[PDB]
Design an enzyme around this catalytic site. Structure first.
Site, PDB file in Angstrom:
ATOM      1  N   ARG A  11      -8.519  -4.429  -2.550  1.00 13.85           N
ATOM      2  CA  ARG A  11      -7.765  -3.503  -3.355  1.00 13.85           C
ATOM      3  C   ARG A  11      -8.613  -2.982  -4.549  1.00 13.85           C
ATOM      4  O   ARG A  11      -8.265  -3.172  -5.721  1.00 13.85           O
ATOM      5  CB  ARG A  11      -6.501  -4.181  -3.893  1.00 13.85           C
ATOM      6  CG  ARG A  11      -5.328  -3.865  -3.080  1.00 13.85           C
ATOM      7  CD  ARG A  11      -4.058  -3.897  -3.837  1.00 13.85           C
ATOM      8  NE  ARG A  11      -3.099  -3.257  -2.964  1.00 13.85           N
ATOM      9  CZ  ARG A  11      -2.635  -3.804  -1.844  1.00 13.85           C
ATOM     10  NH1 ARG A  11      -3.021  -4.987  -1.423  1.00 13.85           N
ATOM     11  NH2 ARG A  11      -1.710  -3.200  -1.152  1.00 13.85           N
ATOM     12  N   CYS A  55       0.793  -1.234   0.000  1.00 15.10           N
ATOM     13  CA  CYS A  55       0.000   0.000   0.000  1.00 15.10           C
ATOM     14  C   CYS A  55       0.830   1.290   0.000  1.00 15.10           C
ATOM     15  O   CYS A  55       0.593   2.143  -0.898  1.00 15.10           O
ATOM     16  CB  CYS A  55      -0.932   0.082   1.159  1.00 15.10           C
ATOM     17  SG  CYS A  55      -1.933  -1.460   1.268  1.00 15.10           S
TER      18      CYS A  55
END
Lengths: 240, 240, 242, 241, 241, 241, 240, 241
Positions: free
Chosen positions: E125, E49
C-alpha cells in the site's frame, strides 16, 4: 586427454632449432612449394628410432620425387643428434640426409601435443603430413615400441596428391581396392539436383548416385604407388 | 587445436548406442579379453567410407583370429546405419558383421576429440587401437578423401601382440626391416651397469649396447604378418 | 532446462545446408515476400516422420496458395535425406518437393532450442511458423511418437494472414466458433475513453466493450479454412499402403 | 529468447494459487492418476481468451472421459478470475468448471518460460499437456491474436494415451492418415537383428523393416478421435451470441 | 529487505501503461507544472482498496484545487481496471476520474520497491507524493489491511506547498500545533553569526535562536488545512451503502 | 535508490544506545508484549522535531493505553539528547518520557535505510510501527520540513489492533468511512466456493461477494478512535508559547 | 587496525560543514599562507573536551602570532556545536573563537581514519598539525579520558617553523635539550665525502661527524618557546 | 594513506628481536603487570634520535617509579644498536638501559603501520603507550626532524594510571587546568536518570550535570606530575656537551 593440432588446420607457426640450423615452420617448406612429413621420436640412440630413420633415409629420393621433405623431431640436443647421426653413418653405412629438430624442453613437443601418457618426458611417435599450403592432412600416432611402416606414408602422400590434382577421393587400399581397383572416386553429390544430374548421363561407372568412379590416374602414377606396397611386402634379400 | 585421448591412456569409459544395441566401452571387449579396433567415418552412404567397410568386412576373419573385434562410429542414426548396411549387402553382396555406433549429436565424437577442422559436423577418419586392458595403443587420423590401408591396421595389431608377449620392440617395416629383417628388438638398457652387462655376451646380435635383437617370433606369426602386406600389394584379380 | 527462440522474436539469422543447397534464414523467404514453416524431425527412415512428410507434400499446393514455403530439419546428413526422399518417392509414390536441412551435429537444432530431454540425440518435433518479415508467429512441440495434424498448421497460417490483413483477432475454433462462428474479433479497447466510444454505435456486435466482432472475411476465406478442417475429419477413401 | 521446460522432462514442482485454492503441480494430478492440460492466457476479460475458455468448458466432459483435468493460467488476480468467470456464466450462460492459476507476478509464468517477446507482461498463449506421471508430452505456443483449436488438444491426449497403452506410435493426421488410415505404427527396430526378425506377418503390414503397423485401436477409440475432428469441422447450428 | 526510491530523489523516469493510455512519469505531470500523488494497491476487486478509490474520488476536487493529480497502481491489467471502475460507478454511484497504472508484471512495482514481504505478489500500500519538479517529497506505507486517511495526504500536500512558497517549516499537527498553532517555522540558523543575528523583532517570536516562527499563511490556507482534518473527524451523515 | 526493511518483515535485530541505556530491538518491547513506534529525526535542537517530541509526549497516555511504547532516534549523542530534553522541559514545561536512540555514526540509520537523499547526514523523518511480535506493520517517511500528524499514528495502531483481534480489514478513513462508516471489512474470499458460500445475512451486509462487512467494534473502541481525529481537527484552546 | 592519513602526505582535499560555514581544506588555510591545527573530539557537552576548548581558546592569540589557525571536529550537528559554545560562553565566560566541523555521519572522521576502537560511534582525540603547503607534520592521538597539553602543540609548531626556516632538526626537549640546550641540529651527512668535509668549526660544535649543531635561533624565538613550557608548568593563580 | 593499530585495540601479538634478546609483545610486559612505552626512530647513529634516547635514559627512574617499561624500535640491526649504544655511553657518559627492537626488514614497522610517507624506508617517529592489559592507550607521531618532549609522555602515563585507578577523566593541561586546576573529572552520566541523580553536594563541584569533578589525587601524585612539566620548562644548568 591432451591438446593437439587438427586435420584441416594450418601447422602452427613456430621457429625451430635443427640439425641443419634454425628454421621456421611451416614457412620453410611452404615457400619452396614443398610438402613435409614431420615425424617425432622419443630419444636418440634408441633402436626402433634408428630403424625408422634408416628406413626414411632409404626412402628419401621417393619422398623427394613427390615434392616431399622430411624432418625429424626429438627431445634431445643438436649435439646428440649429430653424434647419433654420426653413429648411424659409421655403423650402418647410411647417411641421414634430413634435418632433425632438437627440442630439449618439450616446447615444440608440447606445442604439437606430442607429449602423451605413454611416458612423461619422451615424445610420442607422431607423424604430421603437411601440404604445400601448410595444412595438416594426416596424423599418425604409433606406439613407442612399434616402428612405422614408411611405405604407407608414401602411399598416402601419393594418393593425396593424385586426389588434389584429379579432384577425386581415394578408395580404401588404393590402388588395389577390391571394388574399384585403381579407380578414383568422384565426390558425391550434395543436392537432389546434383544427384539427378549425375544419375543421368553416364559420365562414369556408378553403383549408385553417391558412388561413381573412373580411372583417371596415369599408368605411371599407379605403378609408383604400387611399388611402394610391393617394397613393404618383399622380404629383404640383404640385411646388416 | 583440440582435446584428444592419449596413447597409453585407458580408453574413456562410456555407454554407446550401436547397430547391435547398447555397449559399454571398453568393458564389453575387456571382459572378453578382447582387443578392439574402433574407426570412425564422416557419413553413411559415402563412397570411400563404403569401400572401407567392405575392406574391413573382407578381413573380419583375420581380425577374429587375432582376438580383435571391430566397431564403427558415425554421426548418422542407427536407422541410416542399417539402411546403409542393407544397401551394401544388396549391391555389393557382402554383409558387414560388426556394429556401428550411432552418434547423431557428436557426443561420442566430441568425447574422443574426433571432430576436427576438416569440416564442422561429420567426424574425421579416426582409428583407435585398444588392447585387452582397455588401453589405447595407436591412433591414426587419415583425411576425409583418403581411404585407410586396412592391412596396415592388421600388421599393427599383430606386431603389437607379438611385442607384448615376447617383450620386444618392433623395428620399422617389420617383418621386412632392411637392417634386421624379421628380428625383434630387445628393450634398451637404461643404466650404465645394464649397458655393460649387455655388451657383455653371447646373448644377442648387437650393433651397440642399445641396439640388440633376436628372432623370437615363430615362422607362422611372421608369415601371417607377411601375408597382410602381400595382400595390400597385390593387384586385385576380380573387382566386385 | 531448455531455451529457445520466442514468439514475436525475429527468427535467428543463420546459414543452413540443405537437401537443395545452402540457404540463409530467414532471408531466403523474407526477400521473396514469403512466410515459411520450418519443422524438425528426430530422424530419417522413421515411420511417423515419413507419414508427416507425405502429408505436408500432399498439402504443398495449399501452402503455396498461401504464399508459404516448407522446409524440414533433421540431425541426419544430406546423403540420408536424399536416400530417404528417394525411398518415399519410390515406395509411396510421392516426391517430397521441399528442402530438408541436414543438421549432423545439432548446431542448428541446438541454436533453435530443438534439443529436448525426450532424448539426447534427435531433435524434438518442433514447428516454427514464420511470417514474411521474419517474425516467429507460432511454435508447436509435438512428441516423438505422435504425428502432427498438418491441416491445423494450414488453418493457423490462413487465420494469421486474415487477422493481419483485416486487423482482427481470431476466436477459438474459427471459423466454427460456438459463440460467434466465423466472426472475427475487434482488438479490445485499452483505455476508458476507447471503451466508452466502442460501445456507442452498434457499429458492430458486442457482448461487452472488450468483446466486439463483425464478419469481414470473404466467403472464400472462411470456407477455404473450414475445408482444411473438413479434410482432417474425413476418413480417407483410398489409403496409399494399398 | 528464453529458457523453458522441455518435452520429456517432469513438470516443474511448484505450489500455485488458483481460484479453487492452492494446488501443488504436477502432484495434485499425478496422485489421482490424471493427466492435465495447463493453458495460459495473457489476461482476463479479453475476447479470444473468453472464446477459448468457453470452448474448453463445453468440452470438459470429453477431457474428463479421457481422465484429463484442465487448469488455466493468467497474470491476473484470483479476484479478477472469479469476476471474469462470473461474467462468462451470466452473459454466455456457461460455467467454467476448471480452476485458474492467479500469477500476479509472472513467477509461474517466468518459471515456465511463458514470458515471450510478443509482449513484456501478459503471458504467452502457451499450452502444456502433462501425463499422469507428471511428464510434459506436448507444448503448443499460439499467438496472442489467434485462439487455439481445442479439438486438436483432445486429439493429442487421446492418441497419446492410445500410443501409451498399446505401445505404438501415432501417424500424421491419425485416425485419418492417408497412408495407413487408423493404423498405429510399431516402434522401428533399433538393431540389425530386430530389423531382420521383422517380417510381414499377419496383421503387421510393412512398407519396410522400419515401417510396420497394425490396427489395434478399438472402434470406439477411433470413433471418439474422429468425432473431435468432425466437431471442429462442423459449423455450429447454434451460436451462443 | 528491499531497495526503494528515496525522499529527495527524482521520481524514476519510466513509461507506464494506464487505463487512460501510455504515460511517461514524472514527465507527464512535470510538463504540466503539476504535483502528483501515486498510490498503489495490491489488487482490483478488493474491498479496502475500493473504499480508498471512492475516498480519493470524492476528494478529487480538493486535489485539483491544489494543482495536484492522482494516479493509482495495481498489479492487475487495464481490462480488470476498467471493469472494476465500471463496477464502482454502477454499484456505488461514483466514477473514478483518475487513471490507474496496470502493472501485470511488477515491472513498475519492482522499479519503485513496492514489492514488500507482506505477500509475494500483490504490491504494498505505497504512496508517493511528488512535486512539480519530479521530486519525491513523501512516501507512506500502510499495511494491506488498513485503509489510508486520504485527508492526511491532502494535509501533507497543502503544508508542503505552503512551506515551499513561504520558505517555512511546518510544525507537528499543523495547523493545530499545541505550541505555536498555525504558526510556520523559520528554518533555523546553521552558523554562529546567523544565530547571533537572529532576534525576534516585529514578526518573529522565538523560544531560542533555533526555534523561531511567524504566521504568514493566509486565513484561507489555514482553514482549508483545518477543513481536511474536520472532515476526517466527522462521522458521515449519509453512508453510500 | 536506497535499502529499506519491508512491511511484513521482522524489525532487524540490533543493540542500540539510548538516553535511558542500551537496549536490544525489537526484543525489549516484544518481551514485554508491547508494540513500539520508532521515529527518527535529523537533529537535536531543531524546531519541527521539537514540536513533534512535544506532540508525542502529550499523547503518551494514549499510546500506553494501546499497549504501545515510543522510541525516538537522532544522529546526535546522548549528551545532546539529554541537554535537548532538559531545554524542552525548562522552556516548554513538558518532560519527554520516552527514550531517544543516539546514532552518532548513522549505523542504526543506515541499517534502517533512513539515510535518504534529502541530505547526506541527518536522518530522514521515518516512522516504523512495529507490533508485539516484532513485525513492521507500517512505515511513514515525512519530509525534513513537515511535522508529522501524531493522531494519525494513534489511529493506525488502534485500527490495526482492532483489525487483528476481530479478524477484519479496515476501510479508508475509518471510523468515518463514507461507504460503511465504522464497519470493519470481512477478508475477501480467495476461492470460488468461498465466494458462493458468502452470504448477506443479519450482521454481514454485502455489495458483492468480495465486499462484505459488519460492525463488531465496541462503542468505546470506535469512540477512542474518533477522538484522536477530533483532537487533530481542533484548534488548541491554549497554545504553550 | 585502520586506514589513516600519514605524516608527510598532503591533508586530504575535502569540503566540510562548520559552525561558521562551509570550508575547503586544506585550501582555505593554504591560500592564506597559514598553518592549521585540526582537533577532533568525541562529543559536544563532555567535560574533558570542554576543558580543551577553553584551553585552546585562551591560547588563541599565541597561535595567531605563529600564523596558525585552529579548527575543531566532533561527530555532532552544527546545532549542538552552537548550543555547546553558547553554554561555555555563558558558564565559563569565554567565547570559543574558532570553528568546529559538524560531522553527523562519520564522513569526515572516517576519511581521516579518526574512528578508532574506543567507541564505534564518537571520534578519537586526534590532532593533525598541517603546514602552509597543506602537509601533515604531526599527528597526536590522546585517549578519550585524557585532556591534551595544548602548550606542547604550540612548541611543536614553533619548533617546526624554526626548523623549516633555519634548515635544522630539533633536539629532544628543545629548547632545553640536556646535551645541547637550545642548539639546533645540522642535518646528518649521507655520504662518505660529506662526512669528511664536515668537521670541528668549519661550522659547528660536533660530537661526531653525524652529530653537529649550532645556535641559530634568536633569543625571542627561544624565549617564546620556553614561555609555552613555563605556562604549561605553572599552577594557575585563578581557576575559572 | 596507511593502516595503523588503533586506540583501544590490543597491541598486536608478536615476537620481536631486540638489543636484549627475543621478547614477545605485549605478553612480556603484561605478565609482569607492567605498562610499556614503545617508541620508534628512523635510524641508528642519527642526532635527534640520540638526544631522545639520552632523554629517555635520564628519565628512566621516573618511568620505573610508575611501573612503566621502555622499549625502542629502529630499522637497523642489533649490531648497530649495540654499537650505537656503546658510542653514547662512551661519548655522552650515559648508558641506555632499555632494549631496542631490531627490525632489519620493516616487518615490525609495517605490522605497526610505522612505515609512513615522509620516507620510504626508515620508520616514523611513533610512540605507543600500552597498559598492563596490553591495550593501546595513546599514540604520538612526531616528525623526523622534531624530537619528542619525553616529560609529556610521563605526564600521559602518570595521568592515565591516575584516571584508571581513581575512575576519573583528566582535564586539559592537568594538573594545571585553567578551570578546575588539579581536579579530576567524573565521567559524565549517559542516561537521563544518572544525570538527574547527579548533584553538586560537598565534594562534587558541578558546572552542569555533565561536568562534575573532585580533587581525589594525592598531593604527591599532583606534584610529581607538575614536576615533569617543571623539568621540561627549566633551562638546564649543565649541558652534557
Amino acid at each position: 586427454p591432451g591438446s593437439i593440432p587438427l586435420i584441416g588446420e594450418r601447422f602452427p607457426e613456430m621457429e625451430v632449432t635443427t640439425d641443419h640450423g634454425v628454421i621456421k615452420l611451416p614457412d620453410h617448406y611452404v615457400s619452396q612449394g614443398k610438402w613435409f612429413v614431420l615425424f617425432s621420436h622419443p630419444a636418440d640412440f634408441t633402436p626402433v628410432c634408428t630403424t625408422e630413420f634408416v628406413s626414411f633415409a632409404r626412402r628419401y629420393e621417393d619422398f623427394q620425387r613427390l615434392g616431399v621433405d622430411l624432418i625429424g623431431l626429438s627431445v634431445d640436443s643438436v649435439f646428440s643428434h649429430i653424434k647419433w647421426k654420426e653413429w648411424i653413418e659409421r655403423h650402418i653405412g647410411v647417411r641421414i640426409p634430413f634435418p632433425i629438430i632438437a627440442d630439449p624442453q618439450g616446447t615444440v613437443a608440447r606445442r604439437l601435443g606430442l607429449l602423451h601418457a605413454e611416458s612423461a618426458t619422451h615424445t610420442v611417435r607422431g607423424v604430421f603430413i603437411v601440404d604445400a599450403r601448410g595444412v595438416i592432412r594426416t596424423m599418425l600416432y604409433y606406439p613407442m615400441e612399434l616402428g612405422r611402416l614408411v611405405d604407407e606414408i608414401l602411399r598416402i602422400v601419393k594418393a593425396l596428391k593424385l586426389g588434389d590434382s584429379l579432384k577425386r577421393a581415394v578408395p580404401a587400399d588404393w590402388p588395389n581396392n577390391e571394388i574399384i581397383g585403381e579407380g578414383l572416386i568422384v565426390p558425391p553429390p550434395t543436392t537432389e539436383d546434383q544427384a539427378r544430374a549425375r544419375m543421368e548421363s553416364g559420365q562414369y561407372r556408378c553403383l549408385d548416385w553417391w558412388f561413381c568412379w573412373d580411372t583417371p590416374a596415369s599408368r605411371d602414377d599407379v605403378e609408383e604407388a604400387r611399388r611402394y606396397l610391393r617394397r613393404a611386402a618383399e622380404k629383404p634379400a640383404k640385411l646388416l
